Symmetry: C2
Subunit: 185 residues, 2 copies
């Protein structure tokens, strides 16, 4: 494919290098195409990016729903999601690029995705926490808040520890999950 | 002092133009030093930059030392510290140069290694709070080192990935996290 040949390079480059690091040109080189390509479906550079964030985010959320079955209680689903977050090949491997990007385009008026993609990012925690209320596993009045806090705290543990033994990572994340859930009841 | 003049001039350049755009040439001339002297003190731009970060870290700790008096109990020092981490970065000028740098060197072990010794300094703050909290029955934590890494990285996640909301909400959420976390320790 071609449109899905560029994305494959954009993704790989945004991961290896940074957002700025890789530019419209660099893509075309390895992606092997021209300028026009990036016009109809691929408007601006930030467009080709927000696109990938959409894909990747969906791939992850999909993989989660296919694997969330191994977790019988929502308390287990919480633990699992956070753990899985450390090993997926999806979405999380772009957080560094997201930061860079967000701090270099939070000017344009299209912080619309960053607040549209955010809902999908914290939705898994929304469902997990909401369902937990239906199962009496816990009682949280401010779900939306907790969801946001959890998603970001976790994203932090995954992103700012990406420089050490992965079993150490998985250990921490679990001690985290424990402490969090424990502070909820 | 010529070393200090470089660190100072370089800090501003990085702040005004970012890491990548800033060159050792500019730094050399504006600090009225030389390529040779710059090499002898820091060898590289990356190293020069890590030194800046080191100075800053030191200043942050010095600021904390003073600021933490407003918090009598460790429980409070926890709430306060996390709040400071979020509010101060909201307007930290070097922040942009750190990002550019960090997300461009998290692939080299040489640099990523020194950046860990650096964050460790940041994490020590939590380590102290928790240990002192133990020796006061504010809580009981057998895995202080662990909790400290967790607190620090979770707080950082809230600070970094929340940027898309008004500051009072951010503060509110942070304070909410500090509550949940502190509650899950008793």
């Amino acid at each position: 494919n071609l449109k899905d040949k560029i994305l494959g390079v954009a993704k790989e480059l945004f991961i290896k290098n940074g957002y700025n690091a890789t530019t419209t040109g660099e893509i075309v080189k390895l992606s092997e195409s021209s300028k026009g390509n990036l016009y109809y479906h691929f408007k601006t550079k930030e467009n080709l990016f927000l696109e990938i964030l959409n894909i990747e985010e969906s791939k992850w959320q999909e993989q989660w729903k296919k694997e969330q079955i191994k977790a019988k209680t929502n308390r287990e689903k919480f633990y699992l999601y956070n753990e899985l977050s450390l090993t997926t090949e999806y979405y999380y491997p772009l957080q560094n690029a997201i930061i860079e990007f967000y701090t270099e385009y939070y000017k344009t008026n299209s912080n619309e995705k960053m607040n549209k993609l955010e809902n999908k990012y914290i939705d898994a925690y929304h469902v997990i926490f909401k369902e937990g209320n239906l199962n009496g596993e816990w009682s949280i009045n401010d779900v939306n808040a907790v969801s946001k806090i959890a998603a970001n705290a976790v994203n932090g543990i995954v992103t700012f520890t990406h420089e050490q033994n992965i079993n150490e990572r998985i250990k921490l994340m679990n001690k985290f999950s424990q402490i969090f859930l424990n502070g909820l009841s």
